[PDB]
Amino acid sequence: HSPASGRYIQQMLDQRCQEIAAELCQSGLRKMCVPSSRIVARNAVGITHQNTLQWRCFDTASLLESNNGVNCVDDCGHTIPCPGGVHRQNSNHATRHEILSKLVEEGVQRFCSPYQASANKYCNDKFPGTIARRSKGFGNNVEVAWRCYEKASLLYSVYAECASNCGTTWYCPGGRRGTSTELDKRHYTEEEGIRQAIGSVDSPCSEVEVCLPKDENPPLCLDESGQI
Ligand SMILES: CC(=O)N[C@@H]1[C@@H](O[C@@H]2O[C@H](CO)[C@H](O)[C@H](O[C@]3(C(=O)O)C[C@H](O)[C@@H](NC(C)=O)[C@H]([C@H](O)[C@H](O)CO)O3)[C@H]2F)[C@H](O)[C@@H](CO)O[C@H]1O
Ligand SMILES: [Cl-]
């Protein structure tokens, strides 16, 4: 078991989209009659005129290899660029923004570390749209620091440090490579503010318990060992 996000919200959205595609197939929508491996949930634009980011059930065979990028979701419910792009003319998808958004809201309660939630809130309050990671900055692929990152600048396939539900080291999808692209500039380093945000969270365990973090809330609170 790795100290890493299970990406449980994204897993649930993909499974719900697989059911929805199957239902649409049964209603006669031929292009949706596919194996489950062909269907994922992504947050993205759609075809021409569908210009807002919405949750949609995509046929992967209709996605482009690049980036109209598509976004996946972390276990605190933030949308982050994933591999691929929407074909604005040829996309095969079903927009299902309400059911999928509701599943994200439910998942956040289950899976989002209150320590990470506090860090994210700090960042969004100060720089709207940003989330917290301890990751790379511009043109340096070694140094990490707590920063508020514009979500568009993160890569879902790259794991970066985040706060566990014990306020300890964890890793989450949505990270930086430390490359030198314009996107690599889109962050605000906030070591003191983010650390204070994380430190301000009340423990789920008592002062007489040891917090062992888990990929779902609550963490394990084990009775502290005695002076045996
Ligand atoms: C704002 C500024 O110029 N402050 C001077 C200090 O420079 C800042 O030092 C921090 C170190 O914590 C960063 O190196 C920093 O760079 C970044 C960042 O936060 O990582 C680089 C980002 O690309 C940029 N974001 C953009 C362009 O979208 C941010 C952003 O400009 C900034 O966070 C806004 O507050 O900055 C860097 F700017 C400097 O170290 C001290 C003393 O020398 O003086 C400050 O005034
Ligand atoms: Cl996560």
Curated annotation (Swiss-Prot):
Paired cysteines (S-S): 17-57, 25-33, 72-82, 76-112, 123-148, 162-172, 166-211, 205-221
Motif, CXXCG: chain positions: 72-76, 162-166
Compartment(s) of residence: Cytoplasmic vesicle, Secretory vesicle, Microneme; Host early endosome
Residue ranges of the region described as Beta-finger region that is required for the interaction with and correct trafficking of MIC4: 206-225
Protein activity control: Sialyllactose inhibits binding to fetuin, a host glycoprotein. Lactose and D-galactose (beta-galactosides), but not glucose, mannose, fucose, melibiose or heparin, inhibit hemagglutination induced by MIC1.
GO MF: carbohydrate binding; host cell surface binding; sialic acid binding; Toll-like receptor 2 binding; Toll-like receptor 4 binding
Region ranges (MAR domain): 1-228
Major subcellular location class: cytoplasm
Record keywords: Cell adhesion, Cytoplasmic vesicle, Disulfide bond, Host endosome, Immunity, Lectin, Signal, Virulence
Interaction with host sialylated oligosaccharide chains: annotated span: 93-95, 185-189
GO BP terms: cell adhesion; effector-mediated perturbation of host innate immune response by symbiont; effector-mediated suppression of host innate immune response; immune system process; symbiont-mediated perturbation of host receptor-mediated signal transduction
GO CC term (a single one): microneme
Disrupted gene: phenotype observed: Significantly reduced invasion efficiency. Reduced production of IL12 in host cells during infection. Slightly reduced virulence of parasites in mice. No significant effects on parasite gliding motility. No significant effects on parasite attachment to the host cell prior invasion.
Domain comment in the entry: The galectin-like domain has been demonstrated not to bind lactose, glucose, maltose, mannose, heparin, fucose, L-arabinose, N-acetyl-D-galactosamine, or N-acetyl-D-glucosamine. It interacts directly with the second and the third EGF-like domain of MIC6, and with part of the acidic domain.
Function: Soluble adhesin with carbohydrate-binding activity. Binds to sialic acid-terminating oligosaccharides. Required for attachment of the parasite to the host cell and subsequent invasion. Ensures correct folding of MIC6 and transport of the MIC6-MIC1-MIC4 complex into the micronemes. Facilitates the correct targeting of MIC4 to the micronemes. Triggers the activation of murine bone marrow-derived dendritic cells and macrophages and production of pro-inflammatory cytokines, such as IL12 (IL12B/IL12A), in host TLR2/TLR4-dependent manner.
Subunit structure: Monomer. May form homotrimers. Part of the MIC6-MIC1-MIC4 complex. Interacts (via the beta-finger region) directly with MIC4 (via the second apple domain). Interacts directly with MIC6. Interacts with murine TLR2; the interaction promotes activation of bone marrow-derived dendritic cells and macrophages in the host. Interacts with murine TLR4, the interaction promotes activation of bone marrow-derived dendritic cells and macrophages in the host.
Protein name (database record): Micronemal protein 1
Residues shown, of full length: 29 to 259 of 456
